[PDB]
Write a protein that binds this ligand. Structure first.
Ligand code: B06
Ligand code: ZN
Ligand code: ZN
Length: 222
């Protein structure tokens, strides 16, 4: 994969996913996020994995959509979710994450979203944020990982708690809770059974089978 590629594609009316490539532990990996139309504005879910990529994303949005990103949510503290928050903040975007994500990002020395998202501290908590629903399923890929649902389009953004179908073994589990991860996926399945399009943090999107597949991989690990 070539490094530093940033692009986006439309899933539904007013719903896009952005895709970036970045070097991680020496190799090039893809990384997904979400863009959701919020009236005359856009809500951004997750950075494009780095300052340079995220500045490129903001220009790509002007080329393809032409509406201003006014708010951004990071779904956990890893650099592929918050790397670029400083670029967003300087561009005039209000950046958000849960208190736990903000705390864990600070510990790592990663960039720190400005605003705390209240109402997501207990597994099963769900809150509306502009045109999306934010959901804390419980610990999985990280203790703080959030998932995002678009009620108007039945799009489920699982973030890095959800794996793509081609993955057959667990990935990075340094920050994960393997004992809780299957239960947390079960909460997602129970709360969003009508999802028609499911996006992993890395790799190809698909249907709801990505949830059960992720459980399978996690349990077989282990
Ligand atoms: O889930 C994975 O194993 C995975 C797959 C593709 C790309 C990435 C991952 C993953 O866990 N990443 C990542 C990025 C920043 C920091 C970390 C950490 F902190 F877990 F090492 C992991 C990047
Ligand atoms: Zn991560
Ligand atoms: Zn990730």
């Amino acid at each position: 994969i070539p490094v530093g590629e940033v692009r986006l594609y439309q899933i539904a009316d007013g719903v896009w996913s952005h895709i970036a490539t970045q070097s991680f532990d020496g190799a090039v990996y893809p990384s997904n996020g979400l863009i959701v139309r919020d009236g005359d504005e856009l809500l951004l879910i997750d950075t494009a994995w780095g300052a340079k990529n995220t500045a490129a994303l903001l220009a790509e949005i002007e080329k393809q959509i032409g509406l201003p990103v006014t708010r951004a949510v990071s779904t956990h503290f890893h650099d592929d979710r918050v790397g670029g928050v400083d670029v967003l903040r300087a561009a005039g975007v209000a950046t958000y994450a849960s208190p736990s994500t903000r705390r864990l990002a600070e510990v790592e020395g990663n960039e720190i979203p400005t605003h705390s998202l209240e109402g997501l501290s207990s597994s099963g908590d769900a809150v509306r944020f502009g045109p999306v629903e934010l959901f804390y399923p419980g610990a999985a890929h990280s203790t703080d990982n959030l998932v995002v649902y678009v009620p108007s389009a039945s799009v489920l953004y699982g973030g890095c708690a959800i794996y793509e179908l081609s993955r057959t073994s667990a990935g990075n589990v340094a920050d994960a809770d393997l004992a809780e991860w299957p239960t947390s996926i079960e909460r997602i399945q129970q709360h969003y059974p009508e999802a028609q399009f499911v996006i992993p943090g890395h790799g190809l999107p698909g249907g709801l089978d990505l949830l059960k597949h992720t459980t399978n991989v996690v349990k077989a690990h282990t």
